Amino acid sequence: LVKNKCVNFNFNGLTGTGVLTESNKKFLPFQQFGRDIADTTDAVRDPQTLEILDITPCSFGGVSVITPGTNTSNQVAVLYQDVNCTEV
Amino acid sequence: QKLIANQFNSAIGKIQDSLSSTASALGKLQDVVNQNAQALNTLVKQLS
């Protein structure tokens, strides 16, 4: 298992990709996945050693380019929209 | 002038309770939000 590192994964045949993390929320012993309002498979109960993981999207977010006109300068700044400053 | 001050002030007060006990006063703004969310959900589910 690997936590806090974007991974593909498979659990009992459930296949998805995210950032696996420990979570507090408690299940009912026969329940397996989690979900959310949007039917987005979210929590997962760790099949070997029972614990409530999570999932999370990877990052995504767009790239944007903040420039004074090229007529002025070729110096640009780049806005990575909605990511904590780590990946880059 | 004095009477009018009160008629003003009281009228101010009522507005609060015209709100604090009634959420449906905001119906307009309340809908604009819903219809937005109501899209995305309907949009998201289309993935399934």
Binding site: - | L26, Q30, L40
Partner: peptide
């Protein structure tokens, strides 16, 4: 403010509820 409740984003409004 009480009375109100895959690449999908929410871009923050330029202005913000301090400025507004």
């Amino acid at each position: 403010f009480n009375k109100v409740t895959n690449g999908l984003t929410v871009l923050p409004p330029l202005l913000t509820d301090e400025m507004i």
